[PDB]
Amino acid sequence: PSDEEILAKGCDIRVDCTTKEQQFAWAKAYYRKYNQETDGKDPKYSKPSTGAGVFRKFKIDWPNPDPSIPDTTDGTYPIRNEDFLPIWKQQQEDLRAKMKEYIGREFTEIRWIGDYDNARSPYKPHNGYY
Amino acid sequence: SHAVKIYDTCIGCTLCVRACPTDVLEMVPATVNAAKQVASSPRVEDCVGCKRCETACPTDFLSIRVYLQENEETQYSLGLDLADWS
Amino acid sequence: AIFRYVNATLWSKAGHFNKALSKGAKTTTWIWNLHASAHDFDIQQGSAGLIARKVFSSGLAHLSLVFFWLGGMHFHGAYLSNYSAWLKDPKSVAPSSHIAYSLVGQDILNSYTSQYFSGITITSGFFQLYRSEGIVTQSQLKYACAASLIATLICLSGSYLHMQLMSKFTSFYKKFQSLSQSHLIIMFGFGSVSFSAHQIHEALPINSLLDSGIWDPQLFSAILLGTPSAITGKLLNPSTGSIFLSQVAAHHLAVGIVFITLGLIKWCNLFFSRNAILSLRLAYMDYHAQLSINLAVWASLSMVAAHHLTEIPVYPYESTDYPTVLCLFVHHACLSGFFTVASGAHASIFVIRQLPTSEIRHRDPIIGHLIWVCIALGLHSFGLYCHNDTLEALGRPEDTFCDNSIQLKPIFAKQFLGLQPGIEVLDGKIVRMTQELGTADFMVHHIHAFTIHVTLLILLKGVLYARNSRLVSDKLELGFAYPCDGPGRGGTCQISPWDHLFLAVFWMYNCLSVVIFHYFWKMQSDVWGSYVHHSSLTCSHYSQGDFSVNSITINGWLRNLLWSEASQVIQSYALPSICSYGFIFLAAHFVWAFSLMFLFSGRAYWQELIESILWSHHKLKIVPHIQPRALSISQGRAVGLTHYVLGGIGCTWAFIISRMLVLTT
Amino acid sequence: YIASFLAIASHAHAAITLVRDWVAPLELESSCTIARIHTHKAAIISHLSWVSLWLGFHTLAIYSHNDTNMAFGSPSKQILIEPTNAQLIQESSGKALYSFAINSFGSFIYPIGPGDLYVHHAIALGLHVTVLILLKGALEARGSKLMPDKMEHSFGFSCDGPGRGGTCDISAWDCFYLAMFWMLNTNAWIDFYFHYKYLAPRQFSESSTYLESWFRDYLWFNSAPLIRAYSALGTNDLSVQAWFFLLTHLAWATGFMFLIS
Amino acid sequence: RVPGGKRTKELGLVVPIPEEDGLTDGQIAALFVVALVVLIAAVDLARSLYFGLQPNKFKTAKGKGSITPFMKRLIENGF
Amino acid sequence: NTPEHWTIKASKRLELCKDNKAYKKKFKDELYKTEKQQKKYATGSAVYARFNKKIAQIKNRQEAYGDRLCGKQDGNPRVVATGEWNVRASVMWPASIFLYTAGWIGWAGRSYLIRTNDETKELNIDVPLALTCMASGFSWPVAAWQEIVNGEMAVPSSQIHPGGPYTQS
Ligand code: CLA
Ligand code: CLA
Ligand SMILES: CC1=C(C#C/C(C)=C/C=C/C(C)=C/C=C/C=C(C)/C=C/C=C(C)/C=C/[C@@]23O[C@]2(C)C[C@@H](O)CC3(C)C)C(C)(C)C[C@H](O)C1
Ligand SMILES: CC1=C(/C=C/C(C)=C/C=C/C(C)=C\C=C\C=C(C)\C=C\C=C(C)\C=C\C2=C(C)CCCC2(C)C)C(C)(C)CCC1
Ligand SMILES: CC1=C(C/C=C(\C)CCC[C@H](C)CCC[C@H](C)CCCC(C)C)C(=O)c2ccccc2C1=O
């Protein structure tokens, strides 16, 4: 029926509760009434402090704080030197174009096991020197 | 203190006496062996129990035996330096 | 110069070097002593000239051995590796120059590294080293292997020749001023300048082309081209996640110039405080003194290498190759510990064989204060962990030492790089991230200090009380490696410097295991991992940042680090990649347990058991005339120590490598 | 555990009896059981050593064969010796019990498999080695080839010096010290066997033939609740068990200090 | 209770607790009185064990000693 | 209840592997794992050929082991140790061959020791004599039984050290 009346009636194997199903039903009612899933410890002790982007909350290194650690406590880390990535891409593309023009032909993938003649060799090419 | 005993198998080579670190042993005249001398242990009170005599004994089994007695430890047998029981 | 005296007649004598082995093979202790004293050239028959001959020739032979090992590494990279696939796409393909046979189903060990290659993933960083050096072709790797083999042959020839070129008059090895000047100016200064030249002329163009994406043979066969004004180390290669190789080349040029300048000022005698070191100069002109000093120097340099190879990224893609960086750090830390205990050992040997310095005459205060600092450090540092455990178990987190509770802030741990805010990422991985220090870091660092101080205590006690002590006054007569002086004076077990090392090795291993665990867990929780999207990224770390919350308790270390992260190695049997690592985990556990046999038992039990066993052999007429003997006391200690350290190191090795391999793939 | 302690106790007190109670006759006289045993103590010890070596070699080797084959992923390659003798004895007992019933017994008969056979041979190894150490101590207590005059010295003495090659752990008390480790090992093996077969009968039957099953399915797998007892999330009724798990680990590690240094 | 056992959580095993303590203060006091008698007797026994036998008693102690007839019969029988 | 049941074949806890569902499932799973591992690499790869070889090895192993007995629950082949020679996976054949080989090794060795009787020969092996003894050790069963019978194998215990003295001399 319900836990209240189950516990009010109680369980006794000697007299009426000769049924294992009834016995464990009463046991489950008592468990639900008197047992707790967790001790209720404060959730704060489970949250990370270092590496989660929330280091500034604890004020561990307040005197002369480390600049590299983000000041925001939201838990997100910005990418260091974001501004350079477009610049780096532009530099590498410019160098690629410069070398392409200097050579005068499309870049050819090198062969790991391949053999290439030296550009200055005095003998007729066997495999293209490029 | 420990008990240093000498048995007639002794041949009087003096190696035990020479190996003694605190001069517990001494050779004494005897007629039992050809060397005409046997090691003795008069100063057993100074024996520390290092069994260097036993190490240096040549005989098949030792003609000198050091029996350790931990219950009767004295400062001389313990080699006490920082503390004095005298 | 006279090579008619080198004959193979002595090869079959097996003990000619030691006079104590003249009565050849009366027992098995003779075999063990032969092996133990094989390389103790000081106590061997001959003269000081012969000792110097052997020392130098053996150094050259070991040089040849190392060159052979390096040549083998190069050959494996060239012919038995996926270096081509790794170079074109390092991220997708894990480094592997290691292939196993298919003997007994052993082909399962080989794991998927590339489409056309299956093998064992290497963790030595050799691929990154080749990429930094500019080696991008099988021909280049093959010629590197050929050079290494030629160097091996040259060193072998040099050892063989110097065994006879150097005579009793030879004294070039005693010219310490000449030796140091030559090493400082040529070996270090000119070497660094020449390597800077190599980088500038070969590696810089090749590495720049590789970063761009160019793989053209003509290009593969203008400094500071891409490096901005940003301080070196403050800006990593966006496409490689490592310090610019041009900055590295400039570093090597500057270091070579500085070394040359130091050598030249020493040559001109500009350094003036010679007297402050004259006492050491007179005292430590000994083989063992120099060996100890050099071992300590190289141990410290190995530890600095372990730290810097990870914290400061200089090799291409090694930052994101998490197994590589971890293995490099752990390997070099272990070498640091081993060479430090070696320095202690040979300091003790020098004290035994030569006159010690005058700081040994107030040794009692030194070791007494070291004992006190060790006790206080251990008490406080480890009892903070024990306090955390007890209070947390009782249910009082507010009473524990942690960031949320009572917190021990590392006030002195201050930044010096001055980096910009944020982290550096490269293709779904965190190449660089600031490590944030708190109560857990405070506690673990003081644990480190405690263990270091106890190891130092053992080594220093062995060194200072080597000649004599209050207990035994003739330890100098006893020597260096003796088991005891006897059961007397209460018992004089392990009073020798050899036994002091035998214990300092245990303590060094304990220290290094704690250091390895700290580095591993901290990196997994707070540095390594992936990121999920001025842009702000939420960083998902491999261990989920649990170091700062769980490392405050020994139970947290046991659960979140050993048990939780042993899932990979413990459940590695079915997996083709790491089944070998699981088996090695099990076997290392076995070996470590087997070491306790020798570490706990004693000689006499085994000697009596051997005699009882030999009764039956004699009964059946099996009479071994090399009479069986139980291992000596010192040998039993050595065997136990070796097996103990090997088993522990193997367990840690397999555990960490399995975890890293699975997580990264 | 109590039974193992009492067994090793009986052995230790037999050794003490020999040391300070038995009145040995003259050497050539052989009239009492103890003297007759002392006549061929060497044969006894050699045969016990042979049995221990055989058991250890073959148990460990079969376990390692199964380990390697399972690691490579081929259970079919495992050596699985059916326990035919034990199964026959069990079948005879079951026949007798069934006849009695025709004229329930729970846990008196269990499935018994090759894993049971291997574990039983391991436990036999443990018992044989423990008895080896204890018998050697008892029969060498009065005298030994290394220390002929061991009667004069007490039951437990430190050593006999670094001479004669070194004489660590030369006393009958030192043999007991050594046999204590074995008792603990063999008892740990017995308890692990019982606990594993009790917790997971089916998994034990299928997987107990190789040691990785013991290391993974028994220790690592079942260690979760204990270590999770108390943590940053909270505590439960097993927190005391988790603190005594670690306290005892620390006590063991401390014992290592006195044993090694 | 906050159970930590897998089987306990699965099967709902409980640690029932009574409404009233089993024993009363008077009962505990009686048990403590018996325990105090045990303690006094045990201290006396420890003193006797510490001091052992006293063979000097025949010099000063009252009486002339006595052996029970059954003890005499056992002595005559022997071992 | 019958002499026929003495054979391990007629047991209720074992079944032929070719008819064992657990055995079939285990092998099917091994084959699936191997094929899945193979699929990762390219078709014409040397690793692909090696995986084909491994799959063939697994199939031949299954066919060979189908005849052996294995438990119903786990379906892993079992080794018969009753002493029945004419049974698959019998322990007697390996036992007999190993015993012969081990006796060969022991006999050879004992014979070298008897012939040499010198620590110098023990250290520096007399390779000719050692090889001669190794070759001669093939008749070790007959030779050993003959020596045991004729008294050339064991020496009386009075000729060897008995052990430590347990009494007063
Ligand atoms: C036959 C066995 C064998 C052989 C011949 C080699 C050979 C080699 N391996 Mg190794 N390796 C093996 C087994 C083997 N491995 C196994 C089973 C694994 C696990 C999958 C690995 C994993 C592995 C990796 C990941 C790497 C190598 C590498 C190498 C090279 C290193 C040079 C060297 O060994 O210097 C000599 C070095 C030593 C003698 C080390 C001694 C001390 C070690 C580090 C202690 C660690 C624990 C130990 C392994 C186990 C202890 C317990 C055990 C007794 C039960 C060389 C080709 C490296 C390389 O660059 O290859 C090209 C590399 O990166 N190996
Ligand atoms: C866990 C195992 C363990 C433990 C606890 C210790 C403990 C110690 N070892 Mg080590 N040691 C070990 C294993 C261990 N060892 C092993 C296996 C070996 C063999 C290789 C050695 C070999 C060895 C040597 C050779 C030396 C040491 C030293 C020390 C001491 C270091 C200094 C100190 O005491 O600070 C820390 C002390 C502790 C952490 C002990 C626990 C303290 C707790 C946390 C607080 C106590 C609370 C409370 C008061 C308890 C009351 C209980 C009571 C009411 C019932 C310390 C006693 C050195 C020494 O003595 O230097 C002075 C030394 O020389 N050990
Ligand atoms: C001395 C003297 C004389 C005298 C006298 C006289 C008249 C003396 C009278 C003395 C008198 C009237 C003495 C009563 C004591 C009562 C006691 C000790 C009761 C204890 C009761 C106890 C300890 C019970 C305890 C409990 O069980 C209870 C009840 C409840 C249980 O839950 C458990 C406990 C343990 C709690 C003479 C004869 C006139 C002349 C002579 O010359 C000298
Ligand atoms: C059938 C069967 C069975 C059973 C078995 C048995 C039970 C057996 C027994 C056995 C026995 C019970 C034996 C005995 C023995 C004795 C003796 C006494 C011996 C001796 C020896 C010797 C003397 C040797 C010598 C030699 C040789 C010959 C060679 C090598 C070298 C040497 C020198 C070592 C089983 C179930 C298991 C399995 C199946 C089958
Ligand atoms: C076991 C033991 C012995 C007895 C051990 C001995 C005699 C060692 C045996 C040496 C053998 C013969 C060397 C050959 C190597 C192994 C047999 C190799 C096995 C390899 C496997 C993989 C098969 C001691 O003598 C001893 C002495 C002092 C302290 C502790 C101990 C100690 O623990």
Residue numbers in the entry:
A (entry chain y): 94 to 223
B (entry chain c): 76 to 161
C (entry chain a): 1 to 221, 230 to 541, 556 to 687
D (entry chain b): 336 to 438, 446 to 603
E (entry chain m): 64 to 142
F (entry chain f): 111 to 279
Text from the published report:
Photosystem I (PSI) is a multi-subunit pigment-protein supercomplex that plays a crucial role in the light-driven photosynthetic electron transport of oxygenic photosynthesis. In eukaryotes, the PSI supercomplex consists of a core complex and peripheral light-harvesting complexes (LHCs). The LHCs associated with the PSI core (LHCI) capture and transfer light energy to the core complex, which is composed of the reaction center P700 and core antennae. Symbiodinium are the photosynthetic endosymbionts for corals and play a vital role in supplying their coral hosts with photosynthetic products, forming the nutritional foundation for high-yield coral reef ecosystems.
Here, we determine the cryo-electron microscopy structure of Symbiodinium photosystem I (PSI) supercomplex with a PSI core composed of 13 subunits including 2 previously unidentified subunits, PsaT and PsaU, as well as 13 peridinin-Chl a/c-binding light-harvesting antenna proteins (AcpPCIs). Using single-particle cryo-EM, we solved the PSI–LHCI supercomplex structure at an overall resolution of 2.8 Å. Moreover, we assigned 196 Chl a, 20 Chl c, 41 diadinoxanthin (Ddx), 13 β-carotene, 16 dinoxanthin (Dx), 10 peridinin (Per), 2 phylloquinones, 3 Fe4S4 clusters, and 21 lipid molecules in the PSI–AcpPCI structure. Like diatom PSI, the Symbiodinium PSI lacks PsaK and PsaO but possesses the PsaR subunit, indicating its close evolutionary relationship with diatom PSI. Intriguingly, distinct from other reported PSI–LHCI structures, most of the PSI core subunits and half of the AcpPCI subunits possess extended terminal structures that span across both stromal and lumenal surfaces of the supercomplex. The extended termini of PsaI/J/L/M/R, along with the PsaT subunit, form a protective layer that encompasses the stromal surface of the PSI core, resulting in reduced interactions between the reaction center and molecules in the stroma. On the lumenal surface, the PsaU subunit spans across the edges of PsaA and PsaB without obstructing the binding sites for cytochrome c6 or plastocyanin. Since PsaK and PsaO are absent in the Symbiodinium PSI core, AcpPCI-3 and AcpPCI-4 occupy their positions and facilitate the binding of peripheral AcpPCIs, resembling diatom FCPI-3 and FCPI-43,4. PSI–AcpPCI lacks 10 Chls in PsaA (A1-A10), 10 Chls in PsaB (B2, B4-B7, B10-B14), 2 Cars in PsaA (ACar2, ACar4), and 3 Cars in PsaB (BCar1-3). However, the emergence of previously unidentified Chls in the PSI core and AcpPCIs, along with the conformational rotations and shifts of AcpPCIs and Chls, leads to the formation of specific EET pathways in Symbiodinium PSI–AcpPCI.
